[PDB]
Amino acid sequence: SSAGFDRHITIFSPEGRLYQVEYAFKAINQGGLTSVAVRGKDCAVIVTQKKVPDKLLDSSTVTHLFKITENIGCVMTGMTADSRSQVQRARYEAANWKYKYGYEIPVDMLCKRIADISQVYTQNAEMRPLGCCMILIGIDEEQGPQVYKCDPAGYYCGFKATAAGVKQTESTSFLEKKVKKKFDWTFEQTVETAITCLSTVLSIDFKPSEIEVGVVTVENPKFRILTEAEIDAHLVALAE
Amino acid sequence: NQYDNDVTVWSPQGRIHQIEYAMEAVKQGSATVGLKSKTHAVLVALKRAQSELAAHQKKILHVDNHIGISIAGLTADARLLCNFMRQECLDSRFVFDRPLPVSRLVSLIGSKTQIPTQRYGRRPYGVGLLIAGYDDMGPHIFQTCPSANYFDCRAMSIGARSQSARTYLERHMSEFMECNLNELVKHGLRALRETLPAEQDLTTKNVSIGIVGKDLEFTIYDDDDVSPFLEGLEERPQ
Amino acid sequence: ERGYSFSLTTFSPSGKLVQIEYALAAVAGGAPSVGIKAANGVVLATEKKQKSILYDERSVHKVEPITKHIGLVYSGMGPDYRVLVHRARKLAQQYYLVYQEPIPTAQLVQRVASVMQEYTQSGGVRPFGVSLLICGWNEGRPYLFQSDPSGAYFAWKATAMGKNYVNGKTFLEKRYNEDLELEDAIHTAILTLKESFEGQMTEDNIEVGICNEAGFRRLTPTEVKDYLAAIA
Amino acid sequence: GDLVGVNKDSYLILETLPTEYDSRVKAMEVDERPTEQYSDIGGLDKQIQELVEAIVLPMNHKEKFENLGIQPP
Amino acid sequence: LRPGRLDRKIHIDLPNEQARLDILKIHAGPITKHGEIDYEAIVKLSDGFNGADLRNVCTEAGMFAIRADHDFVVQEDFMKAVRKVADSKKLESKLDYKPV
Amino acid sequence: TGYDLSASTFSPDGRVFQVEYAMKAVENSSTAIGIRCKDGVVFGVEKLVLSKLYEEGSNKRLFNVDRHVGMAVAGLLADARSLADIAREEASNFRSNFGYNIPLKHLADRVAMYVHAYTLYSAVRPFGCSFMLGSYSVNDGAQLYMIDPSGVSYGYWGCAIGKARQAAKTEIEKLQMKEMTCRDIVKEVAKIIYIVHDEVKDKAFELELSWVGELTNGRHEIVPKDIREEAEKYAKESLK
């Protein structure tokens, strides 16, 4: 029902809901895209396809994998303009941690800073709540790899393997049947499941050009975007 | 109709109607015609009277020694842009010790009128500026709009029934380059006389002419020294 | 912004404030929680359900410390909780910079609710949707306070917020009494948490923090699994 | 489900009637046939084409579709 | 909607990329054409279309061929037909509904 | 309706109609295309003469942001001159603070964040402009970018803005683009403008051509237009 201006601005419904934020969760879904994150024993893998509908459209200017710092990469879903403006907020406050505190920012402390900013968009009632989603990875000392997610509502929690985009309900139903049956996770064990979870939801069996893979491992903590040659190496590896 | 209220609200067709309403405010003012030769730029205006005892509302106003403008529409937006216009001319006169070229001054006006056409609670400027002057490369005739689209024209007319004023111009635009001032001026006021009812034309109370030239500062005549220009005319046919 | 600054919460013709009543509806649909003050310390207990088997449990926390003797839980919406935590973290420091002394538990509730009451009267913002429970053993006798989005605050021997908060209200009236111990208080706090929880109750389904006169302390999932023997 | 002419007393089929419809439907039939030749409408020439391509050509040239062999819209 | 009266609820959805490819191969059967047909570039521009929409694309691409009286069908008539049909989907919305 | 007034309210399906309305306001303007060869970028703008309406050379939509950076605007006109003043101002601060020429990747990003900033608040409206960005550098090559009214900014080898957008890009991909020199492309761009826009809509039109590349030493300037006149001669060979 409508009461006052509950359908328009960020105020409470009579039921206790507020509709503008839950209108923003399906603002992601017009992107037509699905991102998957999987954390393993000593590595974390981002995998996301892209759609290039034009031959006149370039190849290097499409990729959603955004290197925040030398050890933290991220992927973006939702609409594009809200996603990119989210990134320079993250790039700016990562650098302020180095200037104010000296040492390198943890991956968990960054999602506190982002979600508290995205609170104020919801919290104040004269500003648009930035309908895009956020997924981070990174290596921590004495904690291993991590995977987090920020939301336009402004809440975060860690995960073990969690997808985003359009097809969460199909991918997370696949991963719950996949994770909990006592799987030991090597490096390529995480990568092969990261493609084949997406390859069964979308049912593609793709060329090595559509997807991108960002990786981080505790032997080389630098964030690293793979090349289509070594993407093709892992792709035929699961082709038995 | 509910999206036709504020400047900020776009239309579902994609036309902000507040600017389209401000174009109608320009069409309510009295007509005026500006044009130029190779070496001179002459704009001729038409005055109106509120009553018989009241004096006629003036149209042309001096800005600088080469720039002078005409007016159409409101009178608050007239003087508000006029005070901004006189200010910018003497600033570059104070800083660089040179007169402003006409072209980049008008670009300051389109930047000036841009902000109240985008932010909330601000009307556009209902105004009809015709601009004449010299830069270092000759005469120029400019026109503006409340949508801030300035046009480098050669002869235009804005205000009430300027529809007929434009039609006279293109069938004599080829003559507007070689002729000197005595027939250049009376080419221009042959265009005003079709923006009128068929029983009154120019009887030394409602017309003013401003001329800027090579060896000529921008000079405004009104109703007494206009009388040498108003001789040598044919009447309107029927 | 521009300088609109007008409050979106006005009086009803009946003489009530409607948006504050609607914010309490979001509190009642929150996660259930309980807090019991029994004669040597205060026991707080919440009801933390991960919606999937993929969530991490050692990342997001509910029992949250403010000082070394002051803890704080909630029942409402998640992201608005983390705002006034960081507000109350800083607000405890300006007492300590001035007075060089740990802040009493009654003194925060004067100040935290003053932030929260003024925030409703202010212009162009909604109220919060979080009720709180604040504990602390300051000067021997422990304390247990409860604020709300209406700006008010109270002082409970034992209370419960969240879902089925009136059912646990009748449960605490019969089961609890005047005096207990700290260990008896945890036993009945799980007993009212088992009243409304789901089937399995493990070390990750609930999360319990306590106060002592030795200080505020948060329990690890080991001892919560160890106290889970003789459940409820 | 047919309409037949039956004797009153013997109850025997004697005629086969053409099926009749509702009286409101018979009002919808057009019998005037006005005249609005295409020169009367100006400035809409692209829309006149795409109407004739869609409707007039399947009414006239069935073979031009069937030689390519797909469908009418 | 309780089971026993309506037992099993079967869900039919929008075609996937392989499914958009297959339906396009169905309706492109009896078309007098040339051996130049990139079906893959058509499906790559095809997003969220119905099975009836791909029927429309095969219908409209023939209409470009009836223009200028070419009984054959070139491949370039399809990409004009795809941009026309996808232009007409600025008028429809609310196509998903929750089951039950 | 009821949700399409402000630019700070979401629709109940997950989008913003004020951005949607301003996109097709750009659609009603005339056609401006762009293309790049292997050592330069060629601009081309069709301009309509109404009856007389101006001294020829008036209000040309090929602006000039930096010495090596050019514009090709379409849509609304007055806001395009505002974005030109922002982009000239941004390239001066990069020159003053960092001491060298602005890369086109940053100049696209700084402007697109500024375009994004007017899509979040109810006090201002979104822009009704869209444009191109062409540049050349011997350490970088030729780059061509593209910015919508929403704020999405990435690269192309060729693009088109205006009424004729989809009908104008069908013949752009028919060309070869890698092996071409831009002087060959100057007489190519003339015919794409000349093929489209039959004089049924508007009888009088006029062609501008801007041109930056290796032949122009990185500096941006207009073509020698009255000189060499092989645009219109080679374009009117499309009589059959």
CB–CB of A180 and C53 under 8 A? yes
Max alpha carbon distance in chain E (Å)?
A: 59
- Side chain identity, residue A221: P
- Contact B19/B124 with Cβ under 8 angstroms? yes
- Contact C17/C9 with Cβ under 8 angstroms? yes
- Domain holding F182, by residue range, is 1-240
Using CA atoms, how far residue B128 sits from A162, B59, B139, B153, B185, in Å, is: 62, 11, 20, 14, 21
In chain C, DSSP finds a helix count (H) and a strand count (E) of 6, 10
All residues at 6 or more sequence positions from A187 whose CB lies less than 8 Å from its CB, including other chains: A40, A42, A43, A217
All residues at 6 or more sequence positions from F144 whose CB lies less than 8 Å from its CB, including other chains: F34, F35, F36, F41, F132, F133, F134, F155, F156, F157, F158, F159
Q: Which of B11, B44, B48, B56 is nearest to B29 (CA)?
A: B48
The total number of structural domains in chain C stands at 1
| DSSP summary character for residue C128 | P
* Partners of F75 in the β-ladder: F129
- Domain holding C81, by residue range, is 1-232
Instruction: Give just the sign of the alpha carbon dihedral C173, C179, C180, C182.
Output: positive
Residue of E nearest to D71 (CA): E59
Contacts of A125 in chain F (CB under 8 A): none
| DSSP summary character for residue B56 | B
- Contact B131/B69 with Cβ under 8 angstroms? yes
- Sheet containing strand F40-48, edge to edge, reads F158-161, F32-37, F40-48, F205-213, F220-222
DSSP-based helix, strand, coil % in chain C, nearest 5: 35, 20, 45
- Side chain identity, residue C121: Q
- The two structure tokens encoding residue C152: 């008010």
| DSSP summary character for residue A31 | G
- Contact F197/F164 with Cβ under 8 angstroms? yes
The SS3 call for residue F48 is: strand
The span from the CA of B128 to the CA of B107, in Å, is 15
- Contact A45/A214 with Cβ under 8 angstroms? yes
The span from the CA of F124 to the CA of F7, in Å, is 8
Q: Which of F177, F186, F105 is nearest to F147 (CA)?
A: F105
Q: How many CB atoms are located within 10 Å of the residue C98 CB?
A: 8
The closest CB to that of F59, out of B3, B111, B152, belongs to: B152
Q: Do chains E and F touch (3 or more CB pairs under 8 A)?
A: yes
| DSSP summary character for residue F183 | H
All residues at 6 or more sequence positions from C101 whose CB lies less than 8 Å from its CB, including other chains: C95
Contacts of B114 in chain F (CB under 8 A): 78-79, 81-82
Element (H, E) at B164: helix B163-170
- The two structure tokens encoding residue A216: 């981080």
* Partners of F222 in the β-ladder: F210
Q: Which residues of E touch F (CB under 8 A)?
A: 76, 79-80, 83, 87, 93-94
Q: Which residues of E are annotated as a binding site for ADP?
A: 55
The closest CB to that of D64, out of E32, E59, E66, belongs to: E66
Phi, psi of E93 (to 5 degrees): -160, 170
- The two structure tokens encoding residue A84: 């990119």
Rounded to a whole number of angstroms, the CA Rg of chain D reads 22
State the distance between the two ends of chain F, measured CA to CA, in whole angstroms.
Answer: 49
Phi, psi of E24 (to 5 degrees): -65, -35
C5: left (phi over 0), alpha (psi -120 to 50) or beta: left
- Contact A111/A117 with Cβ under 8 angstroms? no
- CA F160 to chain centroid, in Å, comes to 8
CB–CB of F5 and B153 under 8 A? no
Q: Are strands F141-147 and F74-75 parallel, antiparallel or unpaired?
A: unpaired
- Side chain identity, residue A67: K
The span from the CA of A64 to the CA of A66, in Å, is 6
User: Mutating which of E11, E13, E14, E18 best tests the A interface, going by the most A Cβ atoms within 10 A?
Assistant: E18
In this complex, is the C-beta atom of F124 within 8 Å of any C-beta atom belonging to chain A?
no
The closest CB to that of A204, out of E17, E45, E47, belongs to: E17
| DSSP summary character for residue A175 | H
CB–CB of F59 and B120 under 8 A? no
The span from the CA of E72 to the CA of E64, in Å, is 11
- Contact C45/C147 with Cβ under 8 angstroms? no
DSSP notation for F122-134? SSSPPP-EEEEEE
CA distance D10 to chain E (A): 49
CB–CB of F8 and A80 under 8 A? no
Residue of D nearest to E32 (CA): D68
Q: How many CB atoms are located within 10 Å of the residue A122 CB?
A: 22
- Contact F77/F227 with Cβ under 8 angstroms? no
Q: Say what the resolution is, in angstroms.
A: 3.3
User: Mutating which of B1, B4, B10, B145 best tests the F interface, going by the most F Cβ atoms within 10 A?
Assistant: B10
DSSP-based helix, strand, coil % in chain B, nearest 5: 25, 20, 50
Helix axes B102-112, B76-95, angle to 10 degrees: 130
Instruction: Sort E41 into a burial class: Cβ within 10 Å, 0-12 / 13-18 / 19+.
Output: middle
The span from the CA of F11 to the CA of B118, in Å, is 23
Q: Which residues of E are annotated as a binding site?
A: 2, 5, 27, 50, 55
Using CA atoms, how far residue F236 sits from C183, D73, F190, in Å, is: 96, 37, 9
- Side chain identity, residue B161: R
Q: Which residues of B touch F (CB under 8 A)?
A: 3, 7-15, 107, 110-111, 114, 117-120, 147-155, 166, 169-170, 173
Question: What size, in residues, is chain C?
Answer: 232
The total number of structural domains in chain F stands at 1
The span from the CA of C54 to the CA of A72, in Å, is 22
* Partners of A214 in the β-ladder: A46, A225
Contacts of F4 in chain A (CB under 8 A): none
The technique by which this structure was obtained is cryo-EM
The closest CB to that of B152, out of F18, F58, F128, belongs to: F58
CA distance A57 to chain C (A): 38
Rounded to a whole number of angstroms, the CA Rg of chain C reads 18
Q: Chains with 3 or more CB pairs closer than 8 angstroms to F?
A: A, B, E
Residue with tokens 């892209």: A50
The span from the CA of A192 to the CA of B63, in Å, is 76
Instruction: Sort E61 into a burial class: Cβ within 10 Å, 0-12 / 13-18 / 19+.
Output: buried
Q: For the domain that residue C81 is a member of, what is the CATH number?
A: 3.60.20.10
Q: Which of F176, F172, F177 is nearest to F196 (CA)?
A: F172
In this complex, is the C-beta atom of F238 within 8 Å of any C-beta atom belonging to chain A?
no
DSSP notation for B71-108? --B-SHHHHHHHHHHHHHHHHHHHHTSSPPPHHHHHHH
Three-state SS sequence of chain E: CCCCCCCCCCCCCCCCHHHHHHHHHHHCCCCCCCCCCCHHHHHHCCCCCCHHHHHHHHHHHHHHHHHHHCCCCCCHHHHHHHHHHHHCCCCCCCCCCCCC
- Contact A113/A101 with Cβ under 8 angstroms? no
The span from the CA of A164 to the CA of A171, in Å, is 9
Using CA atoms, how far residue F137 sits from A240, C211, F100, in Å, is: 47, 67, 12
- The two structure tokens encoding residue C229: 């023997």
* Partners of C34 in the β-ladder: C45, C160
Q: What is the dihedral of CA D11, D15, D18, D19, to 10 degrees?
A: 10
CB–CB of F170 and E94 under 8 A? no
Q: For the domain that residue F218 is a member of, what is the CATH number?
A: 3.60.20.10
The span from the CA of E41 to the CA of E44, in Å, is 5
- The two structure tokens encoding residue E71: 């009984």
Contacts of A32 in chain E (CB under 8 A): 47
Instruction: Give just the sign of the alpha carbon dihedral C145, C147, C152, C158.
Output: negative
The span from the CA of A78 to the CA of A222, in Å, is 26
Give the start-end residues of each E strand in chain A.
35-39, 43-49, 66-67, 73-76, 134-140, 144-150, 157-158, 161-164, 211-217, 220-225
- Contact F131/F73 with Cβ under 8 angstroms? yes
Instruction: Sort D65 into a burial class: Cβ within 10 Å, 0-12 / 13-18 / 19+.
Output: middle
Q: Which residues of A touch F (CB under 8 A)?
A: 7-9, 19-20, 23-24, 26-30, 54-58, 60-62, 79-82, 84-85, 88, 126-131
Contacts of E87 in chain F (CB under 8 A): 166
* Partners of C71 in the β-ladder: C65, C135
- Contact B224/B204 with Cβ under 8 angstroms? yes
Q: What is the dihedral of CA C198, C203, C206, C207, to 10 degrees?
A: 180
The closest CB to that of F170, out of E79, E87, E94, belongs to: E79
Q: How many CB atoms are located within 10 Å of the residue B99 CB?
A: 19
- Sheet containing strand B68-69, edge to edge, reads B61-62, B68-69, B130-135, B138-143, B151-153
The span from the CA of F209 to the CA of F186, in Å, is 8
CB–CB of A53 and E44 under 8 A? yes
CB–CB of F156 and A57 under 8 A? yes
Q: Chains with 3 or more CB pairs closer than 8 angstroms to C?
A: A
Q: Which of C114, C75, C84 is nearest to A116 (CA)?
A: C84
- In terms of DSSP H, where are the helices of C35-126? 78-99, 105-121
The span from the CA of C45 to the CA of C32, in Å, is 9
- The two structure tokens encoding residue F172: 């752009």
Contacts of B149 in chain F (CB under 8 A): 59, 77-78
- The two structure tokens encoding residue F148: 């919508």
The closest CB to that of A27, out of F14, F116, F159, belongs to: F14
The SS3 call for residue F141 is: strand
Helix axes C105-121, C78-99, angle to 10 degrees: 130
CB–CB of A203 and E16 under 8 A? yes
Residue of F nearest to E76 (CA): F170
The span from the CA of B134 to the CA of B129, in Å, is 16
- Side chain identity, residue B20: E
Three-state SS sequence of A85-138: HHHHHHHHHHHHHHHHHCCCCCHHHHHHHHHHHHHHHHHECCCCCCCCCEEEEE
Residue of A nearest to F172 (CA): A56
Contacts of A131 in chain F (CB under 8 A): 10, 14
- Contact B48/B30 with Cβ under 8 angstroms? yes
CB–CB of D53 and E66 under 8 A? yes
Q: Which of B47, B86, B26 is nearest to B226 (CA)?
A: B47
Q: What is the dihedral of CA C116, C122, C125, C129, to 10 degrees?
A: 20
Q: Chains with 3 or more CB pairs closer than 8 angstroms to A?
A: C, E, F
